Design an enzyme around this catalytic site. Structure first.
Site, PDB file in Angstrom:
ATOM      1  CG  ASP A  67     -55.656 -17.652   3.194  1.00  0.00           C
ATOM      2  OD1 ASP A  67     -56.317 -17.341   2.180  1.00  0.00           O
ATOM      3  OD2 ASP A  67     -55.974 -18.586   3.956  1.00  0.00           O
ATOM      4  CG  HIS A  87     -56.948 -21.714   4.220  1.00  0.00           C
ATOM      5  ND1 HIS A  87     -57.481 -20.507   3.817  1.00  0.00           N
ATOM      6  CD2 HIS A  87     -57.953 -22.617   4.128  1.00  0.00           C
ATOM      7  CE1 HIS A  87     -58.750 -20.673   3.494  1.00  0.00           C
ATOM      8  NE2 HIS A  87     -59.063 -21.945   3.674  1.00  0.00           N
ATOM      9  CB  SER A  98     -62.329 -21.444   3.480  1.00  0.00           C
ATOM     10  OG  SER A  98     -61.674 -22.298   2.556  1.00  0.00           O
ATOM     11  CE1 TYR A  99     -68.441 -24.088  -1.826  1.00  0.00           C
ATOM     12  CE2 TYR A  99     -66.411 -25.154  -2.559  1.00  0.00           C
ATOM     13  CZ  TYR A  99     -67.755 -24.866  -2.751  1.00  0.00           C
ATOM     14  OH  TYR A  99     -68.411 -25.363  -3.859  1.00  0.00           O
TER      15      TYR A  99
END
Length: 573
Positions: free
Chosen positions: A258, A286, A116-117
């Site tokens: 996602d 996600h 993710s981030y």
């Protein structure tokens, strides 16, 4: 002693501006320098259990001789400075990599991994000119923040993604706060209220008016909401254009449901020619990597294979950070979970080499409105010129169900669509029941001939696998905001009644439609809150009041002269 290590907490690393970021050092008991792996996290470096289950059992890397560095992003938790999304990660990443390379325990080889981030920050670090960075492993990430996760290829705001993420970060910001404030208690309650009903939070108008979120994170409005066009403010934080010039190996992971899938896949295509790129795509969303969904089970083999991923990442890093030329022997370039047959399968490239981009034309007798309409799909062009019409009212948009939702009910990607099959504004087109399997694996898009009574509106397209038992399972979908039909940068309005041929980017999928199933496509003008609602006015959507928005009579044209169709990436083996 091989297998042993130590952990140093809160080592403060000074950035170029003097601000120090906090990192935790997991270093193997060793004689001499070792290769190092870096993770840049905005959700507390201490909280490893929160994200690790969606990544790798990375302590295995440490036990195998790698040092691992986990850092709190600027302005969060143990780090000093002020927090602002994306803007400082390129510089801070560069300075952190530089610091690591200067340490006595680093042998000059650095890599990165994370989800993710933790993945987006890797592309930002990769575009720096740091030779010491030998490889990255971005999972469920993007290199173009406008395309994913804030807006999209279609030019519509991913409102649930924005509000959900803002609430999550907001919660972190309050937690990271030096001294507890009197209002923190109330704010925590308000943030929870948003997360419990994202659609409700996204329904307020004007949308731009966010008393809570706008106060906790001004960036949410100043940057995201206020910049609907893919202008310079966005291009400034985008890394995609710079990927083609890189030569950095990248182990890219994505999920069919996602939110970042389209962009994750695009990064693989952008770097595969200049360096060793790898791709792994599972049927995950996600927040759900279990392989289990309300009305669709992919099997235990579909569960995020964390140990296998750990072994693959280690081989990848052994090859690029340790110089073990044969470390990736036997490892496929691409690994996909092919739905329908629900099996993992290795591939030599993405897109697949043998892809037949095949048009499936919209057609049928009568109106295609609802699942009981006469809408059909066929590889043959429709013989009679027809048109399906419906009223799109912003006050009553088509509810988002599955797909690539991130925060609003984002744990049911392959959602059964029957609950909304039956709305008059949901046009349905299906093939006859299949007698032979049809595999669709690759990028998906639609080209529709449309017209509207308004000067602007949206058009959506969703691919669905209809099961014999009735389940109509969502696969992939896209949207096109008409003002951005030709460009996301310089939008122009449309003329009422005029027919336009527009493209809808429906991201990608891998599914074998088995005998007994049907290939189905839903067409509409809304998908809320996955995307915000078009006001059908041509005005600044996020600043408009619901009462001042308009309804729109939209029409899909199909026939010899207007061959509307979905392009399916057909694989025949």
């Amino acid at each position: 002693v091989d297998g042993n290590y130590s952990v140093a907490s809160n080592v403060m690393v000074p950035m170029r501006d003097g601000v120090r970021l906090a990192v935790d050092l997991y270093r193997p008991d060793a004689d001499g320098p070792v290769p190092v792996l870096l993770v840049r996290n905005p959700f507390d470096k201490f909280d490893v259990f929160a994200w690790s289950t969606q990544s790798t059992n990375w302590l295995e890397f440490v036990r195998d001789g790698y040092a691992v560095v986990i850092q709190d992003t600027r302005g969060l938790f143990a780090s000093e400075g002020e927090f602002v999304p994306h803007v400082d990660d390129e510089a801070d990443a560069e300075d952190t990599l530089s610091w690591i390379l200067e340490q006595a325990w680093c042998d000059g080889n650095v890599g990165m991994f994370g989800v993710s981030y933790l993945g987006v920050t890797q592309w930002q670090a990769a575009v720096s000119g740091v030779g010491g960075l030998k490889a990255i492993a971005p999972s469920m990430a993007s290199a173009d923040l406008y395309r994913a996760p804030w807006y999209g290829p279609g030019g519509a705001l991913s409102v649930e993604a924005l509000l959900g993420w803002s609430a999550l970060i907001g919660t972190g910001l309050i937690t990271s706060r030096s001294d507890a404030r009197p209002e923190d208690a109330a704010d925590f309650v308000q943030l929870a209220a948003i997360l419990n009903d994202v659609a409700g939070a996204a329904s307020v108008t004007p949308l731009a008016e966010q008393p809570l979120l706008g106060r906790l994170i001004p960036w949410v409005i100043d940057q995201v909401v206020d910049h609907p066009d893919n202008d310079e403010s966005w291009q400034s934080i985008s890394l995609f254009e710079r990927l083609g010039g890189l030569a950095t190996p990248a182990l890219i992971t994505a999920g069919w449901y996602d939110g970042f899938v389209g962009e994750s896949l695009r990064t693989f295509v952008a770097v595969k020619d200049n360096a060793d790129a790898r791709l792994v795509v599972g049927p995950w969303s996600h927040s759900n990597l279990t392989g289990r969904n309300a009305d669709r089970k992919f099997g235990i083999a579909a569960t995020y294979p964390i140990q296998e991923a750990t072994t693959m990442h280690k081989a990848f890093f052994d090859r690029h950070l340790r110089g073990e030329t044969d470390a990736l022997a036997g490892v496929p370039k691409v690994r996909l979970f092919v739905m329908g047959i629900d099996e993992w399968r290795d591939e030599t490239d993405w897109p697949l080499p043998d892809t037949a981009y095949t048009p499936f034309y919209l057609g049928g007798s009568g109106a295609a409105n609802t699942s009981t309409g006469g809408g059909t799909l066929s590889t043959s062009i429709s013989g009679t010129e027809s048109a399906d019409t419906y009223l799109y009212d912003p006050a009553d948009p088509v509810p988002s169900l599955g797909g690539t939702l991130l925060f609003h009910n984002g744990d049911n990607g392959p959602a059964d669509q029957r609950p909304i099959h039956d709305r008059d504004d949901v046009l349905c087109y299906s093939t006859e029941v299949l007698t032979d399997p049809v595999e669709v694996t690759g990028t998906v898009s639609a080209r529709l001939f449309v017209s509207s009574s308004a000067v602007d509106t949206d058009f959506t397209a969703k691919l669905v696998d209809v099961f014999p038992d009735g389940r109509a399972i969502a696969l992939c979908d896209g949207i096109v905001r008409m003002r951005y039909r030709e460009t996301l940068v310089n939008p122009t309005l449309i003329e009422a009644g005029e027919i336009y041929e527009v493209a809808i980017d429906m991201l990608a999928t891998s599914n074998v439609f088995l005998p007994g199933h049907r290939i189905m496509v839903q067409v509409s003008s809304s998908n809320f809150p996955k995307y915000d609602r078009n006001s059908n006015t041509g005005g600044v959507i996020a600043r408009e009041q619901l009462e001042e928005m308009c309804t729109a009579v939209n029409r899909i044209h199909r026939g010899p002269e207007h061959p509307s169709h979905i392009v399916l990436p057909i694989i025949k083996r």
